[PDB]
Amino acid sequence: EAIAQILDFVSSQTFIPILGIHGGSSMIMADKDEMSTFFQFGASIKQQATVMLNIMEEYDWHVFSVITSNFPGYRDFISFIKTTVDNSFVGWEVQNYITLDTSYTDAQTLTQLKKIHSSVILLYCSKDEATYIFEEARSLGLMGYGFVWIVPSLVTGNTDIIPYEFPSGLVSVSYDDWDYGIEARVRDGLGIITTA
């Protein structure tokens, strides 16, 4: 996860165009700086959530929780849910809306989480955080039926490796490699560069 930001940092100073075709570089990153940076991995997290919402629209209503636990957009993710809810085209609503993890007893967040009673858990934390969260959920009882998990690239990114404790059946979803060849991405980009 960190890698993208680092290369992005180099981009802010250099002004040399950069992009990436696979893996972590392709994995999403925090808001791009005013000076243009490298940027192929990033997608509107909002959009990503609207994708997830489409899944929610099919089978999800009154989502259990959306929590700004870790990494980029804790504040940013928070707004969109509101933006999605703001249209008020349908009948949307939220039950759980908190933040936090590691610094103190997990419990202040946990006791608050105990209060919410809803159908789908929304996750915006890194796989590392998530690892702990998995541990939290089993104790919490979130792992039990009626508490579906919506998981982004933040965790999903390690396709090769899934923490056993990851209470499965919750939706984990991001881009898939077989569909598109990793090598395939590079030529096209080069072509784009040429056309640019």
């Binding site: 490298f38 940027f39 192929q40 990033g42 939706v171 991001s174 881009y175 898939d176 569909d179």
Partner: peptide, 23 residues
């Protein structure tokens, strides 16, 4: 705005019963 394909090429993955991301 993320430099990413405008029409996202996305797939939905479920954590399966036995450690598998069934499509």
């Amino acid at each position: 705005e993320d430099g990413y394909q405008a029409n996202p090429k996305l797939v939905v993955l479920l954590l399966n019963m036995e450690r598998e991301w069934e499509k």
